[model samples]
Target: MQVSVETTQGLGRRVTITIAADSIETAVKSELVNVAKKVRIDGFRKGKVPMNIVAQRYGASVRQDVLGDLMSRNFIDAIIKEKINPAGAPTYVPGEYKLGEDFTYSVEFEVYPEVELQGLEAIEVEKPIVEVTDADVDGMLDTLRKQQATWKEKDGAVEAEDRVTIDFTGSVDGEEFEGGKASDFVLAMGQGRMIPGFEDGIKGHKAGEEFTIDVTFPEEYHAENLKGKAAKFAINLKKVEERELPELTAEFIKRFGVEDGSVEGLRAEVRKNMERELKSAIRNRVKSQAIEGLVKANDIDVPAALIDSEIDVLRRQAAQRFGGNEKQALELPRELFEEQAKRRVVVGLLLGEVIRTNELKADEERVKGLIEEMASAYEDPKEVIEFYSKNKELMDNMRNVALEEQAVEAVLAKAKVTEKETTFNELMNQQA
Candidate 1:
């Protein structure tokens, strides 16, 4: 076997491999001999069938199998010899084969670009600091109250955080479209779930009021014909109701799994949980800024192959997000994911390079800490932690997560950072 490779434009390589016909013939002959031993002939004894006849009968298939094996084996061998780390699968093209002639094939592929590390000091990050106040926990408890709260009929005008049951008929240009009408649809105010001005139009209206609310479809609206179109919803306000908070009693306390069933106990546990959530939120916000900073500070070629694969992943995520309806997912354009996917690939490459250059290993302590932290929310922390220890894939995934997070820390260690005080809700509400 012989191997040669040439660099193609833009992080690609074309490799051609040639295999000896005699070597191919030798394997084919050896396999034919084995076939001869097990043969039966019409006019000859079972073991006495002619070798030439066996070769004539099976030679084509035997040669094809040998070629298949040879191509895969030598392709791996050639890649190893050339130290080529392909970013994606190669496009293989096999050459014609004939008697006593060497066979050749070529494979084209892209390699991961060599990333050049840049000055981290040039990157700047803002860190958000949050302190969980007793007030915050009280606020969180009120959130819990809202979660379990029941709605009761209100006497007067609609207000924020109130629930309303209404019948609405929506139409565009005096004609109703699909899904434009519903009866007794219960809507909770302050969710901002409906199109802009839809809920706002319902606001301040009293029960039994029939009104028409005009709203414009957002420019990026999902529906094909509705983008930036004016629409009107004829609304019948059947009822307006406000939430009745659940009493902060022993039962309400126990419902939250605080077995001690005391308000102070609930406050302590809630405060601890809030602090944990706040801490995590802060870490995440800072890590994101650092990652963004690092990505901006570095300059390197990103392989198109990697970007393509990342786009595929983004498509899957979007598909799942669009209710996981198969057809709906496929309808999202490839162009939609290019920006996000490229950024993600760059982030992956940067973080991976950080790990590789520093010889960083996944911190076992942090991994365990992460596992414990996650398992703490489960019913049996010890069993969950034990399960993590026993599952290698799960353990490695956690390790990789820890390693990547530590890589972010490495980036932060050199990057310029300034502290910014932020409210808990202010930080928590923000997302990628």
Candidate 2:
């Protein structure tokens, strides 16, 4: 057997393997010898059956079996001998096999890309400082209160902070646009969820009042045809309600399992959780900025094919998560998901390269720690952590995430990262 390899761009390789026809013929003859004894001839004993007759009878079948086995076994052996790492399945070129001749075939597949390393010291970015504030705690408490805040029937005009349930339809240039129509749209009067003036127009309108408002769509609106176009929205206000905060008495405290629930105790609990959330948010924001900086600074040529393949993989995974329902899958915009998947693939390639170049360990121990840390948030922390520890693949995935995060940290340390201290409130609200 002889083998040759050729390099292809974008993590691809082509391998050609040729096997001698004589070797194949020998194997087929040897196998036929065993069949000669088992064969029953019309006029002779099985053991006395002629070899030539046996070969003539089943030579085609025997040759095919022999060649298939030879190619399957030898191809893998050659790849291993050459130390070729394949990313996915190897695709064999068709029409490469011929009988009674030297067997030749080629397979093309993706391998790990060569990642160039830019030392961490050369990269620079900004890291948001972790900070928590009393106002942040108060804000969190306010959110919590709103979660428990009951709606009280309010008389008079609609106002900010009021919840209005209405049926509405929006049209641009007298033509309705997709997703611009809704029924019983429950929106907070001040929340900018709907198109700009949708919320504002509802303000000061009492229950049972039907109104129409005209507002121009933003210039940057996603719909090309509707951008900056004047749109008329017809809204029928069905109900308006306002928040009725619970009294800060012991009774309200009991509802929250604070047996002696005092405002102070609530503040402490809220503050601690807010601080933790703020810290995580800030770190996430910093990590994103760090990765963006590194990717830009390196200016590496990441294979578009590799990224696209990864995107397809992610799409399949997402489809799997949706229970393989075509309708659910179709509901998701493929292009948007593809973009997200591509980002992840690029990030993975960058980090994988960094790990390979620096010899930085995406250590198992660190991965275990991560699983334990995440499990701690669950009700059955020990079981969750143990499950992850037992599942090697899951553990590796977590390790990959950890490695990427550490890579970001390493880059930030080397890069010109400016540290700007921010209030916990500000960090928590960061658009990370």
Candidate 3:
């Protein structure tokens, strides 16, 4: 066998391999003999077919199979010998194959770019410094109260956060329509759950009030018949209710899994949880910046083959999330995922290079720590930890995550880092 390689263009490769005619002849003869032993033909018993009969019946297919096998086998060998790492499947260029001649064929492919790590010292990683302030914990506690708030009937006018029960009949263009009327319909006011002006119209009304308010259905309303149409609701405000937060007591604290069962204890627990969240949030914020900065600091000519493969993955994921059939997934426009796919390919290639250079390993201690952190959210964390430990797929995924974290850390180790102070909400809800 003989191998030759050529560089067609940026990251593009063309390789040709020649296989001796004697090797093809030997392989064909060996395969034909096996076929002849088992082939059954008309007027012949099973396994009694003659060589000529078998050759005449199955020669073309056998020869094609042998060619395919030899081509693949030799292609791998040629690539290894030439020290080329292909980015994706190669396209075979047509070539001649004859009985008395050496078979020669070429394959065209894109090789992974030669990424040289550089600009590491210039990438910026912003480290957010945050403390779970008392006010932050109080805000979280207030939100929790709202989550478990109980509504009590109140004698007053309708107000924001008030639950209003009413009976109303609605008509569009002065004519009643389907789903335009309801008796004892309950709406939580100021939620914007109703159409524009509906809640505003009810805001100042008192119990036992009967009145009428006019509203127009928004142009984008889902009901086709009502879009951008004028409507009127004859209101009957039966009752108004206000939300009352539960008193902070041992019983309430116990429900939230606070063993100490006191307001102070609850505050401590909330503060601890918030601190943990802040830590994870800052870690991720830094990680994202580290990665994005690494990509920006270096110029990488990502292979198109990798981007296309990544696009396929993103398309399938999008289809599963957005509700479409398999055929529709295949038809999703590549432009939707192209930019993102290119970024992912660049990141993957760079991080992979870092991992290789640094000899990064998913240390067992870190992997175990990750499993513990995840399992701690479950009811039976020990069992969950044991379960993940025994799961090959889960463990492998966690290891990949661990390796990625290591790669990002390696980037951060050599990068410029700045501390940025931010509030909890600002840190958590910052723009992607």
Candidate 4:
């Protein structure tokens, strides 16, 4: 057997392997002899069949099988000898084969790229420092109160923060459009649920009143026909109700799982939950910056095979998200995910390179800490921890996450990180 390799475009290789016909023939002959010892014929005993007849009867299939096995086995050996790390399956090109002639085949595949380490120390990262102030907690409490708030009918004109029930029919240029009509629809004033002027026009109108609200759709409206088109809604005010926030009474406190029904205890519980969320938000923010910095600092070529595989994963995930209706998922355009898939592939390659170059390993203590932190959110933390520990696949995923985090931390350590003070709301609400 003979083997050779040539480099193709970025991270790709063409490998050729040739096996001599004498070796193939010898193997076929030896296999035929073994078969001759156990085969039966129509008019001859099992051991009495002629070797020529055996070759004539089963030669085609046996040769094919032997060639396949030979190619597969030698492919692995050749790749190992050549020290090529393939990213995915190979495309095979077979040469002509005949008796007394050598058999040749070539496989083309992409190899993992040689990642070039860039200037890690020059990467600039902003580390956000945020504190959940008492005012922030108060705002959160107000939001919670509003969530439990009730509504009472009020005899007056509609005002901001008031809930109004109405019947409305909207049309563009005098023709009704889809999603343009609703009867007895409840909307909160100033909530921005309807078009810009729809709710505003409802204000200052008493119950049992009828009015016309003219508004123009934004130029970028999702519905093409309605974009920047003038529309008018015929509104009939049914009722106007004012919001009544729930007081911080014992009943309200107990409703939130505070068995003692103490306001202080409720505040503490809320603060604890808020603190947990704040901690996670801070970590995620920092982690995002670290990953972005890494990707921007390094330049690497990503294998197309990995991108295709990641896209398939994203497609399947999307299918599952659509209630497991794969037919609908298939309708989604592949290009829609191309950019995202490329980003993920690049990040993956960079992370892998960082881990390898730095000789980083997932720390057992940090792995356990992550598991504990995750399980801490559950009521039965012990059971959750045991469950994670027993599941090898889950444990492996956690370990990978830990390793990636360590890589990010290593990058951030050498990075030109600057501390930046930010409000809790801005830090938590900012887009990644």
Candidate 5:
């Protein structure tokens, strides 16, 4: 056997393999002898068929099968011998072949690029310095109170934070539009659910008031017919109610799993949860920055195959967001996700190289901690932990996240980190 490898454009390699005619003839003869024992023809009994007869009867198919299998096995051998690391499946290119002649074929594949580490110290990581204050806990508690709030009918004009039920019909140029009329529709003031100025016009209106309000639709409204159009609404305010927040009593606190049932206990729990959230948010921000730095500072050729695979994964994910409408998801242009996919693949390759070079392992303790933290929200935290531990796929996923974190941390360690004080709200509200 003879093997030759040629470097193609952009991390691609074309490999050709040649098998000697003598070896092919030997294998064909051996295969024919085996076929003769089991094959039965009209004049030949099972196990009594002549080798030449068997070869004559099944030579074409048998030779084709032998060539395919032999080529597949030897191709792998050649790649290994040449130390080629392919990024994806190889494309087989057919060549000329005859029974007693040298067989030649070629395979094209993209190889993993060589990644060189560089500029680790120049990467700047922003470390968020945050403290969960009492005010933060108070704000969170108020939000919870609002979630459990009840509404009571009020005898007054509408105001901010009031829920108002009304009947209204909206029209453009004196003609009613689709989805522009409703009866007994309840809307919260200042929620921005309605068109701009719609709620503001409803504000200060008393019950049973029959009035007309005119407003202009925003230029970017979803309905093409109504965009930037002037519209009028005839309003009838039926009811107005104010939200009544639940007190921070023992019962209310117990609803959130504070068995001890004390305001201080609830505050403590809220504070603890807020601190946990702040820690996670800060860590995520730092990790994202470090990974971005690593990717930007290094120049490496990424395999097109890897990018294509990542695009498929992203497309499927986007389809899931459409509730499994695979056709709709697939209809989206692949170019929309190409840049994102390229960045993800590049970062993945860089991180993998960093892990390999540094001999870094996923921290077992951190993995356990992450699982425990996630499970703590469940009724039976112990059961959740046990289930994750017993599931190999889930455990492996958790370990991969841990490994990535470790790699990012290693990068941050060598980075020029700057500490910046940030409030809890600011850190939590930052977009991912």
Candidate 6:
């Protein structure tokens, strides 16, 4: 066997591999001996078929099989001979293969990029002070109260917090069409759930009053038929219902399955949950900023092949989630997430470099703590932990994530980090 490698743009390596004729002959003979046992012919019983008949009957297929096997059996050898660390499956370029002649083929694949992370000590990570407050708990309670609201019919005009039932039919060019008519549809005023103009149209219209509304759909409407189109709706006011919210009391907590049902207990639970959320969100934000700063400072030359392969992986993952066909999945371009994918690739390479150069090890205690924290949410905690214990790949993926976090933290520790005080109420107000 002989191997030759050529470097292409963006981390691509084209490997030309050659297999000796003697090796192919041996492999083909071995495969045929196995094929002969199950092959049947008129004169030969099972396992008694002559090699000539088996070869004549399954020659084409067996040759292809031998080629495939030869490639698979020797792919690692080719990679080792070429000294290429492939990111994913190689794109095979076919070459000539004959029964008694040496076979030659080429495979193009992305090699792991050479990465050296610099400016590690100069990168600054801003850590947000995450604290969930009483005000945040109260806001959550208010949302809950709205969720438990009851609707009641009223004989008046529609207003904020009012549900309106109407008989409406919209038309274009004096012709009424599909999706333009509803006999009785309940719409909550000012909810913003309806179309942009639809919500505003219901406001100030009183019950038993027949009215006409001229509204235009937004340019980005989901339906092509009504997008940016103007239509007039002839409507009859049916009924209006005002939302009567439930009180924030111990009784409400009882309805939530909490036996003690104290407002204090509920508030405590809400604050705890909110604090957890804040911690998670802050961590992600900090990580993103650190990655962005690192990439900007270093501008590490990213290999296009690695990004393409990662995109392919992402595409397959998405397709698997939705049960889509492979063709459609491949058609879904990674260029859509190019910037994100590229940053992620850079971060990954940087993490590897950091680990290698610094001789840093992941915190096993932190990894174990994360596993326990994640398992805590499951109904059967012991079983969940046991399941991960039995799954090496799953546990290894988690450990790698922990290692990445440690790498990020190690870099973050070398820089100046400012603790920015932000109140939970301030965050909510910003959201508002």
Candidate No. with top lDDT: 5
Candidate scoring better on TM-score of 3 and 5: 5
Q: Give RMSD to native, each candidate.
A: 6.6, 7.2, 9.0, 7.7, 7.7, 7.4
**If scored against the real structure, what TM-score would every candidate get?**
0.69, 0.66, 0.59, 0.61, 0.63, 0.63
lDDT for position 138 in model 4: 90
Between 1 and 2, whose lDDT is larger? Answer: 1
Off by over 4 Å in 5: 1-56, 65-111, 151-262, 303-305, 319-324, 363-365, 418-432
Error of 3 at 302 (Å): 2.1
lDDT of 4 by residue, 317-365 (tens): 7667434656565555577566789888787777877888888977999
Please, what are the lDDT tens digits per residue for candidate 6 over residues 1-432? 455655544343334345886764665556656654545333354556555556656776765666566566567896898787665576666656666655455556556657776776677777767575566677787765554455776665666667777778768657876556677887766556666677677678777777777878787554445668887777787778887654446443345644344668767767767878877798887788877788777876776877877787777766665455675778665655565678778878877888988998767788888889889876678988888878987887888988887876787778778888876555556552
Summarize candidate 1's per-residue lDDT along 1-432 as a digit string, tens digits: 445655444443334345687665565556555544556333354656656566657766675665565556667897897687655666666667666655455566545655667767777777777667677667777765555545787688777668888887768889887556687788877565666567787788778777787788887775545778888777878877886664556544345565544668767778777777767777877777776666766657787887887777777677675446555555567787888888888887887777778889878998988888789988889999999999887988778888887887787787878898888678678475
What lDDT does the true structure give each of the candidates? 0.71, 0.65, 0.71, 0.71, 0.72, 0.69
Report residue 75 deviation for candidate 5 (angstroms). 9.0
Which runs of model 2 end up more than 4 angstroms from their true locations? 1-22, 25-112, 125-130, 151-156, 170-173, 184-197, 214-231, 240-243, 246-265, 281-289, 310-346, 409-432
Query: Which of the numbered candidates is closest to the native, going by highest TM-score?
Result: 1
The predicted structure with the larger TM-score, 2 or 3, is 2
Indicate the TM-score of model 1: 0.69
User: Which runs of model 3 end up more than 4 angstroms from their true locations?
Assistant: 1-57, 65-111, 124-126, 150-159, 162-269, 312-336, 418-432
lDDT of 6: 0.69
Model 6 off-target regions past 4 Å? Answer: 1-65, 76-108, 128-131, 151-156, 162-201, 206-242, 246-260, 309-335, 359-364, 390-393, 420-432
lDDT by residue (1-432, candidate 2, tens digit) is 445655444333344445677765565466555554456433354556656566667766765565455555666897897677565566655445566644444555544566666656665556667665566566767666655444688777766667778877767778776556687777765444567666776677768766778878788664444677887777777877885665666545346644354668777767666767767776776777766766667655666667666665666566665346543544545564666765676677777776767778777676777777678766789888889878877876677688876776666666776888865456568474
For candidate 6, the 10 contiguous residues with the lowest summed lDDT are 8-17
